[PDB]
Design a protein around this ligand. Structure first.
Ligand SMILES: N[C@@H]1[C@@H](O[C@@H]2O[C@H](C(=O)O)[C@@H](O)[C@H](O)[C@H]2O)[C@@H](O)[C@@H](CO)O[C@H]1O
Ligand SMILES: N[C@@H]1[C@@H](O[C@@H]2O[C@H](C(=O)O)[C@@H](O)[C@H](O)[C@H]2O)[C@@H](O)[C@@H](CO)O[C@H]1O
Ligand SMILES: N[C@@H]1[C@@H](O[C@@H]2O[C@H](C(=O)O)[C@@H](O)[C@H](O)[C@H]2O)[C@@H](O)[C@@H](CO)O[C@H]1O
Ligand SMILES: N[C@@H]1[C@@H](O[C@@H]2O[C@H](C(=O)O)[C@@H](O)[C@H](O)[C@H]2O)[C@@H](O)[C@@H](CO)O[C@H]1O
Lengths: 385, 385, 385, 387
């Protein structure tokens, strides 16, 4: 039905619908005032100290590739530029000690996680979202990222979060902790179990956290370590090839009706279950059996199944606790309204230009859709790397 | 739409459509003459020595619980008594040296696999499928199961097959290889990676072999080792809970349209991907937030999406290579027509009586269906056991 | 003080003091009649079913290389011929059910250990101790080794014993168990911990069992599997190289006074603690900076510290429970008089001819002797292989 | 005859511990350690070594003499020697971080200071009242900053992790800023590296050498002790390392030969009797196992002490340690070993930190295990443990 160009307009519309309340309010210093703090228990204490950074860091981590595109004068180009300026205005506010939207980095341990997503935003759009900020704003982000070191010894997983962050400071040529990078890189490698899956900690689990955290961030950390001879091209390649393998499962779990199963912890992160697939696509490294077009069509179906209606939004435009609908019963205890903005992490292909094959090739059936209609189903097999 | 009593009727109709060509031809001694030998390459050499025992063992492993029921006068009862007699007659012919449907145990290593599935049939229905056999037939199977030690080894993902087969021999009071049972038990425990998942051999894959082989056989073997103190109630509970946890994911991977992802090796085994769910349901051990009726309805959707139409059958009603359609391009090199009769393994809940709540309870949306329409969605989390 | 030629005359004399009471009695049919059964508890029930095969198989495995030499007219050459002939005679009585000295292979699991040692004798001197046996005697040994499989014994550190035994059956072209060879080969490798040390079981231990069993039997098993493509040359070099490393520690723990530490389990096996050193010496594969002569002089000092006097012998010339003297308190509960004939296992260098540099090169201090007196001391360091 | 008493044995250990350690301690007090201490290396090069070897001499020396100095003062001839040497130590410790002093020690250059700061920290942990508390507050703060400046050179070798962990636990104990993450990682990596029967691996690679005595056991236990009161390491963990050390000491006590030698094997045999720090530490804690008595440990290590220090074969013409094992044998020195490196030799004298009236020093002579076994005496059965 819809074309690649129409698909892009859909993604733009849905990505705007998710991310704009976060970005715009931060730009107006009203994010604390206007964003709900919805929790399963209903308690806001504790949550209120951490939830805004989660919203900013997760929102920008997903919109960043789109905003890294060169400006132009298309109807989309206007939107990209309007969004980017509001983002930069927001980031100055988030570290301005005088702004009512100043973001917490010191109370609680949770800031470790979401500074990593804010760093991923920067690593995905450095020329668009980091460099234009003024030097005092840059310094505050440098100091805020460094201040996280008094809590990083905490949760076993969360190791990679602070590795990503320290490798960000290494790549910005300021003080960084070699130890936290060596430990986290080496532990993520040890946590590989096979066939494109790590464990997020000592015990393996079948959940979406390989796409939520592990694959995208390990590659991004290793890329930072490479130029300084801290990681080798061989272990960058090994992590990259493992993300490419993990994406095959993610593409294959999209059903013919454009749904995907709800399993494991934090199903409230919705389409961030596909960040592995989305990152691989943005890097033009999709597996050989998978055409870009079928990734665009599958994720377009998932996107409109989950964000075109308002089942996942409240009366003022914010994401509500749930999976597809208002389902607070499925939210983990650490989840609040801010954490839900993991939703953006499937929209990374927007960082491909509008003239990329991914957005221009004719519609294509994705794997499961071919499988169930008697079409060409490729053989799949475990990999040993 | 349909009621539980209709769902039972559909399952019987569809299990009949899968297994009757195999059981009837073997009973009449024309299984070799009539059954196709389809392969991805088109060659029949090698395959023709092993494909028939594949069809017989794989089929019986799945239909055995249904045939363990006591006899009734009802229409369904007439079907059961009729099918059971043809299995008994076919089992006689299969080790009769004069019958043209003599099956191969002695050439190649592959009879190791399929002897284990045939053993499983005997294990799931001893009084209905084993005790009625004549003494000569009994000793012939005992001898041929013992002749399999000659090939053995690979130390890999066939090891659990021989462990099941030697545990059968132990349960029957005959000579058996204690070392093979011990190595299979300890190695399968050591291959547990977590959250209900084993690795099949020393290599983790994300595929259906946990359903195809691991959970159902490990539990069945331990149950054979329990009476004689070769396994403990502790390690049996361990495997039982591991299978139950695994079933949680399989139930959740049924999409609202009654489909499920195609991923990993041997996707050609179709609904065998749900044996772990089917075995748990038969044992009345579904995790208590997963109702028996919603398992019945979910697998009714999968069962007729794959078997009610003929996209998976040739002109004579045999299974063909593929997933949903004739798709020989998804088949593994080792796969042939008889391999496909794994398809029976999701029908084990027909071993539950017609008045069991599994077949009599109200219609119920399975987990994905509720999740995507905005109904209750039970939170999930990784387990440590 | 003493020359190489005299050193050899001492090894022959002391080896004769140890091995002849076992060998001569077995040849005369009087081993059961004459050999004591000494135990820490003083009990003999149970021990009396197994101690005799312990004595034979442990004794032969140490004298075998000496007996593999070709005959000559020298004072020492006449002794080899006399001993080999008594060994052949004893071996025929051993499986002769008319002989009073028919050894037990059927009661208890212990036969697994000592059959393996008996097998090691044959492997070290095939031409001299196996090939001259009559055909009925050869077949009885084949049946006796095969009849052990019913007793796994588990213990998991008896795996190498059955693996060596089975690989001996393969080496003779008769029916062997593949599975047992494969599992024992792969387990010992899994049990490598580093730096020339295996763990003899799940956990590492600092004891002499690496020299009692692991290295010599692992190298010997692999050498059997090499012709039949059953193990690669690379995994034979690996095991060989690990033994050569281990021998360095054993060479170095011989103190300047010709003692060595008493430590770990089963110190009652006495100079068998040097079996890896002795086997490396026999194979002319000592490392660069370990002279063959210094191994000769180091082991000569140990050999007469323990065997020249009578502290370790009883009034009848049999080994007694102890380290150096009658010290039954250090015996394991499973140990009896027969167990003690592991003491032959440091005498393998007599498998080198008298004209070999090991026996003709002039005296030389050993590593600890040189170091404590101030001479050259080569840098040691851990190895990675 | 040749068999000494317990009172004599303590005197011999004082004489010998004094022969090793007084050149280092007295020169640092005088401020002439850089001037006078040799810098001996197998190659002969001094570049790089001269930046690290002085802290090596200081930290290693102090970690071995520290228990002796923890004893309260008295007016015996030995109590005089402790008072004098202690006061020189506090003098040398002031010079060591005086920017004015010429014996100022390096903490900024190279990675090696991580190692030797840890040994110095271990002296402080073994005699807090005697070597740390009497320091002026300026000198104390200076040490704190030097220990904290070690984090910028980090993410170093597989091993060395225990060193930084002990250091960070020391800063934890003093109530000053510490890196909790470096503590969490070194506690857990060491727990993962246990292979069994009393042996860790020093990093991912297992090796049969004396580094379980050199570093592993004493610093693991000493680190967990700092972690216990602070709700950061359980009694279960601390007793676990403690029993593992007691098991390790059984092998080390057993490897002493009847003639009073021990085998040279594995890396850095140049550390000489540091191969007995595990035995020495367990003897000092009075947690020897049931079948090894304090007397046989004293007598065994008295034989070892004077087989290597009574004579001058390990000393140069000025009383400095030379490269080797028992003699001038520089060919067994690793490339990282200098003259400072060799003052690990003090770590076997920990039992001098038991008072002169302890059973360790008062009980009659007693053969040690190997000595008893080779002459036909009681030999206790050994067996691998599972803990
Ligand atoms: N609160 C702990 C929990 O923290 C959660 O971790 C997530 C992750 O990526 O691991 C992150 O997405 C989320 O924002 C954060 O709240 C997590 O550490 C688990 C597992 O140890 O335990 C919870 O106590
Ligand atoms: N024939 C080999 C093949 O064996 C296949 O293994 C499957 C399994 O359990 O993994 C089993 O379901 C199937 O019936 C059996 O044919 C397989 O082991 C592959 C590699 O895994 O190599 C083939 O030679
Ligand atoms: N009897 C068991 C005991 O067997 C002993 O094992 C030794 C070995 O090689 O492991 C062997 O040298 C000796 O002949 C044999 O008697 C031992 O396996 C221990 C530990 O598993 O348990 C005892 O019951
Ligand atoms: N410089 C490296 C070297 O450092 C040495 O480590 C020793 C240890 O504990 O392993 C320590 O005793 C010594 O003071 C220190 O200089 C060592 O890490 C080795 C590792 O093989 O490599 C050397 O480059």
């Amino acid at each position: 039905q819809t074309t690649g160009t129409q698909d892009r307009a859909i993604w733009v519309k849905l990505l705007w619908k998710i991310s704009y309340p976060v970005i715009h309010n931060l730009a107006e210093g009203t994010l604390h005032q206007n964003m709900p703090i919805e929790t399963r228990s209903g308690e806001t204490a504790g949550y209120k100290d951490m939830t805004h950074l989660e919203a900013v860091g997760r929102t920008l981590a997903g919109v960043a590739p789109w905003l890294a595109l060169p400006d132009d004068d298309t109807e989309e180009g206007k939107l990209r530029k309007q969004m980017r300026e509001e983002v930069l205005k927001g980031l100055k506010n988030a570290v301005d000690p005088a702004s009512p939207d100043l973001l917490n980095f010191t109370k609680h341990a949770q800031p470790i996680v979401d500074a990593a997503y804010l760093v991923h935003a920067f690593l995905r759009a450095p020329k668009a979202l980091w460099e234009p900020l003024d030097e005092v704003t840059k310094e505050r982000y440098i100091k805020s990222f460094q201040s996280l070191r008094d809590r990083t010894g905490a949760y076993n997983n969360w190791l990679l979060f602070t590795g990503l962050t320290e490798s960000f400071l290494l790549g910005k040529g300021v003080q960084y902790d070699q130890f936290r990078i060596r430990v986290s890189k080496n532990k993520v490698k040890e946590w590989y179990v096979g066939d494109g899956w790590y464990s997020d900690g000592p015990s393996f689990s079948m959940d979406n956290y390989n796409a939520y955290v592990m694959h995208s961030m390990m590659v991004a950390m290793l890329e930072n370590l490479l130029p300084k001879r801290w990681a080798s091209q061989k272990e960058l390649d090994e992590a990259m090839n493992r993300m490419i393998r993990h994406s095959e499962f993610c593409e294959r779990m999209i059903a013919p009706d454009g749904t995907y199963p709800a399993f494991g912890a934090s199903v409230t992160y919705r389409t961030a279950a596909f960040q592995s697939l989305a990152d691989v696509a943005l890097r033009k490294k999709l597996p050989s059996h998978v055409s870009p077009a079928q990734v665009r069509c599958a994720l377009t179906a998932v996107h409109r199944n989950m964000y075109e209606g308002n089942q996942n939004f409240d009366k003022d435009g914010w994401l509500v606790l749930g999976f597809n609908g208002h389902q607070p019963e499925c939210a983990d205890g650490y989840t609040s309204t801010g954490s839900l903005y993991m939703a953006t992490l499937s929209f990374l292909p927007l960082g491909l230009p509008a003239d990329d094959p991914f957005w221009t090739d004719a519609y294509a059936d994705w794997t499961s859709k071919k499988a169930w209609k008697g079409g060409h189903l490729h053989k799949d097999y475990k990999v040993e790397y």
